[PDB]
Amino acid sequence: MDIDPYKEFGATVELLSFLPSDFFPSVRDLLDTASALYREALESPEHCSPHHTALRQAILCWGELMTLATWVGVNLEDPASRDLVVSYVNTNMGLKFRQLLWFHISCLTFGRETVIEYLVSFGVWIRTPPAYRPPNAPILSTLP
């Protein structure tokens, strides 16, 4: 059906592809950040924000996938098949959920426009050759 996860917010898969795949934090760190910062808002009966709705959906889907991983690990018999299944569900969709979690957590923390211009700036920085790339890569922060 070709739905873009970030089209409604303002980004695209291509804009999120400026950051290298290994730039994103791990799933556990992202989930801990989301909990610690917005547990009371992600466990509330109100539409706090489209970012909150997207985080709720993504967190439920990741819980779905983790229950799948536990179920296959504790029920399936073939050890090699179990290993490949768990590795796939932890890496291939792990990256796709790391991207969503990072995008929405960073948007809620700093600002959607701030995250968009940060994506553009980091694209510029990572595109600059290493010889002329300054050592200070752009970061999202509220401090001088």
Interface with a second copy in residues 70-99 (CB under 8 A): 71-72, 75-78, 80-82, 84-85, 88-89, 92-93, 96
Instruction: Please give the angle made by the CA atoms of 12, 126 and 115, to the nearest 5 degrees.
Output: 40
Does residue number 137 form part of the binding site for a second copy (CB under 8 A)? yes
Phi-psi region of 111 (alpha: psi -120 to 50; beta: other; left: phi over 0): left
**Contact with a second copy (CB under 8 A): which of 54, 99, 108, 112?**
54
> What is the Cα Rg of the chain in Å?
17
Question: Restricting to residues 1-20, which ones interact with a second copy according to CB under 8 A?
Answer: 1-5, 7-8, 10-12, 14-15, 17-18, 20
Site for a second copy in 18-37 (CB under 8 A): 18, 20, 22-26, 29-37
Q: Quote the CA–CA distance of 54 and 45 in Å, as a whole number.
A: 14
Q: Does 66 participate in binding a second copy (rule CB under 8 A)? A: no
Half-sphere exposure for 104 (CA within 13 Å, toward CB):
28
